Design a protein around this ligand. Structure first.
Ligand SMILES: [Mg+2]
Ligand SMILES: [Mg+2]
Ligand SMILES: [Mg+2]
Ligand SMILES: [Mg+2]
Ligand SMILES: [Mg+2]
Ligand SMILES: [Mg+2]
Ligand SMILES: [Mg+2]
Ligand SMILES: [Mg+2]
Ligand SMILES: [Mg+2]
Ligand SMILES: [Mg+2]
Ligand SMILES: [Mg+2]
Ligand SMILES: [Mg+2]
Ligand SMILES: [Mg+2]
Ligand SMILES: [Mg+2]
Ligand SMILES: [Mg+2]
Ligand SMILES: [Mg+2]
Length: 48
RNA sequence: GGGAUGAGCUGUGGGUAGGGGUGAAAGGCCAAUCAAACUCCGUGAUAGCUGGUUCUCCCCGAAAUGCAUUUAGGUGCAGC
C-alpha cells in the first residue's frame, strides 16, 4: 500500500531557494549588486 | 597683578522659557551642551555618500565605450 513515506513531488517541481550573501562559493559578499552607487542600496524607479 | 564706599560684594526667598528669555553686546549665557537647550514621540527620519553582508564545488565569463541627462563619483537605453 502507498503510505505517507512513499509520497514525493514531481521531478522539477520543487527547486531550491537561492540564499544570497553566504560566502564566496555562492553569491558572495555583494549578493549580485556589485556597485557602489544607487543600485547597491536602493531600487531605481521604472519611470526614471 | 586690578578693584577694594561703590555703576561694590554677598546671603535668603522670588520672577522671566526655546525663534522664546536675558544680554554695559562677546552670538555671550539659559544645569560641564547653544548661529535656536533638554527629554519623549512622529521614527526603524532621510543620505545619488562611506562601511559591513556568513558553507562548497562544476561550467561559461565581462566593462570602464556611445547617446541623453540640474548631468559629469548618479541613472536610463545601446554595446559587451
Ligand atoms: Mg518562502
Ligand atoms: Mg568577506
Ligand atoms: Mg562594499
Ligand atoms: Mg551598478
Ligand atoms: Mg596699583
Ligand atoms: Mg590685592
Ligand atoms: Mg587700592
Ligand atoms: Mg533668543
Ligand atoms: Mg561677530
Ligand atoms: Mg553650559
Ligand atoms: Mg532650527
Ligand atoms: Mg512618518
Ligand atoms: Mg538609513
Ligand atoms: Mg574560460
Ligand atoms: Mg558617469
Ligand atoms: Mg544598463
Amino acid at each position: 500500500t502507498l503510505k505517507l513515506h512513499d509520497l514525493r513531488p514531481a521531478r522539477g517541481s520543487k527547486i531550491a531557494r537561492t540564499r544570497v550573501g553566504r560566502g564566496d562559493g555562492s553569491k558572495g559578499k555583494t549578493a549580485g549588486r556589485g556597485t557602489k552607487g544607487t543600485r547597491a542600496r536602493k531600487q531605481v524607479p521604472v519611470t526614471f
